[PDB]
Amino acid sequence: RSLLEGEIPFPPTSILLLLACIFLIAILAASALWAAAWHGQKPGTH
């Protein structure tokens, strides 16, 4: 029953850290923009 066992719900600050992990997913979006950079190649077949 004591809080030491951990049964208490995780602090709201903790779940906010999980949102930080989502921010790393945003950086993955930046990698997608690099995919757009590939377009620079000439239209000619390669």
UniProtKB/Swiss-Prot annotation:
Undergoes ectodomain shedding through proteolytic cleavage by ADAM10 and ADAM17 to produce a transmembrane segment, the TREM2 C-terminal fragment (TREM2-CTF), which is subsequently cleaved by gamma-secretase. The chain crosses the membrane at residues 15-35. Coiled coil: none annotated. Expressed in the brain, specifically in microglia and in the fusiform gyrus (at protein level). Expressed on macrophages and dendritic cells but not on granulocytes or monocytes. In the CNS strongest expression seen in the basal ganglia, corpus callosum, medulla oblongata and spinal cord. Monomer. After ectodomain shedding, the extracellular domain oligomerizes, which is enhanced and stabilized by binding of phosphatidylserine. Interacts with TYROBP/DAP12. Interaction with TYROBP is required for stabilization of the TREM2 C-terminal fragment (TREM2-CTF) which is produced by proteolytic processing. Interacts with PLXNA1 (via TIG domains); the interaction mediates SEMA6D binding and signaling through TYROBP. Forms a receptor signaling complex with TYROBP which mediates signaling and cell activation following ligand binding. Acts as a receptor for amyloid-beta protein 42, a cleavage product of the amyloid-beta precursor protein APP, and mediates its uptake and degradation by microglia. Binding to amyloid-beta 42 mediates microglial activation, proliferation, migration, apoptosis and expression of pro-inflammatory cytokines, such as IL6R and CCL3, and the anti-inflammatory cytokine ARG1. It is linked to Polycystic lipomembranous osteodysplasia with sclerosing leukoencephalopathy 2: An autosomal recessive disease characterized by presenile frontal dementia with leukoencephalopathy and basal ganglia calcification. In most cases the disorder first manifests in early adulthood as pain and swelling in ankles and feet, followed by bone fractures. Neurologic symptoms manifest in the fourth decade of life as a frontal lobe syndrome with loss of judgment, euphoria, and disinhibition. Progressive decline in other cognitive domains begins to develop at about the same time. This is Triggering receptor expressed on myeloid cells 2. The chain holds residues 161 to 206 of 230 of the full protein.
